[PDB]
Design a protein around this ligand. Structure first.
Ligand SMILES: CS(=O)(=O)N1CCN(c2ccc3nncn3n2)CC1
Ligand SMILES: CS(=O)(=O)N1CCN(c2ccc3nncn3n2)CC1
Lengths: 220, 220
């Protein structure tokens, strides 16, 4: 029986909201956020990981295009292949494409595997967020209403399953009879509810939130 | 220990080569080809499955755009969710977007699940082709050499891991020192080696062939 609500911020597994600026690196922020939680679960330490390291290093071999987009799964595979990712403090975010500057001296996490959830299954996504941790997802963030979200549970009749923006599901619940996913964005604290958006849950895979979920793991 | 060469056509698990014509339905052909093999393994029948059913019915809610492209994995999820796919004979291919005409009375196959292989791992792809069946993959077909291919092992110096064309790996082997993946295309029998292309194997994930591999399975 799954909990009726989850919020991984209550377990110290979520870092401060980040600001991606004019660089389309949401995929990199989504991927580091999922791995940050697993790092906390394994080591007890909450550490922001380097989205810039993914932008600069998880590049064309990984199907990624830096500030012009990419994939959370292939970011995970780069972390596996590279045998590490640097901390954000060591390898800070510049919102630009740069030369690869990875250095194992500054490694703050590893990754051993990743899992992709089945397409559109919000029950399976609920299980994963309850039992595994925060889950990387894509959402359709194209609609003017998304940018203007301030409160409540986001439901946009014009939303599609054509996803364009990587984000992080850190929880779920029910507000005033509306089920929601708790989503951490990378547009700074100004966006939404201190950087978060509650997005409609069990409303037909609204905005594609359960289309392409993935999460990493760190083994012994 | 894996076999040095595999060809699923010798196992009776590969249908005749199809012709997509002016419709970008490669994803749909790739998906039905992978499931046709599993249907043969479960039932003993080799049956062409309806790519048109996927074009018409695995649409916006699956992130697909019919003749303008789509995903093999979300095609598999459509078949799971729909509890079926029709035969090609009952629901033939017209190389255009149509209204959904699925009818369960023409069901030829089901799907219980699908598996996405880890990114870029040609050894894992080899294991899957040897032990599970033909595998749906994407390749970078954005080079004139792919269109002009006639025979032998295809290697394109300009190839990338930015994949755009869904195809089916039906085997692997080597041509006098040159390892290859045996790929079934959907550009008719005049393409390549009577519909097939042998693509370079163990050459750094050449043309992204091991970027995004998936295969479906049928209950039992
Ligand atoms: C950057 S994004 O968050 O908008 N989004 C783009 C789509 N991505 C896909 C696409 C097909 C697919 N099949 N399996 C996993 N995916 N993931 C996920 C990342
Ligand atoms: C139509 S295609 O054959 O060129 N190709 C497009 C890319 N697709 C992706 C994309 C991201 C992704 N992340 N994980 C799994 N995939 N699959 C697979 C299908």
């Amino acid at each position: 029986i799954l909990p009726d609500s989850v919020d991984w911020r209550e377990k110290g597994c979520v870092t401060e909201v980040k600001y991606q600026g004019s660089c389309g690196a949401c995929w990199a922020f989504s991927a580091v956020g999922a791995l940050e939680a697993q790092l906390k679960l394994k080591t007890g330490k909450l550490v922001s990981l380097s989205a810039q390291n993914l932008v600069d290093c998880s590049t064309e071999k990984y199907g990624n295009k830096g500030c012009n987009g990419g994939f959370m799964t292939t970011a995970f595979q780069y972390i596996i292949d590279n045998k590490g990712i640097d901390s954000d403090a060591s390898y800070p975010y510049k919102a630009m494409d740069q030369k690869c500057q990875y250095d194992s001296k500054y490694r703050a996490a590893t990754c051993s595997k990743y899992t992709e959830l089945p397409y559109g299954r919000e029950d399976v996504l609920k299980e994963a967020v309850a039992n595994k941790g925060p889950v990387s997802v894509g959402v359709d963030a194209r609609h003017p209403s998304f940018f203007l979200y301030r409160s409540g549970v986001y439901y946009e009749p014009s939303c599609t399953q054509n996803v364009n923006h990587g984000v992080l599901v850190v929880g779920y619940g029910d507000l005033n009879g509306k089920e929601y996913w708790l989503v951490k964005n990378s547009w700074g604290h100004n966006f939404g509810e201190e950087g978060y958006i509650r997005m409609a849950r069990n409303k037909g895979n609204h905005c594609g939130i359960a289309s392409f979920p993935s999460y990493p793991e760190i083994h012994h």
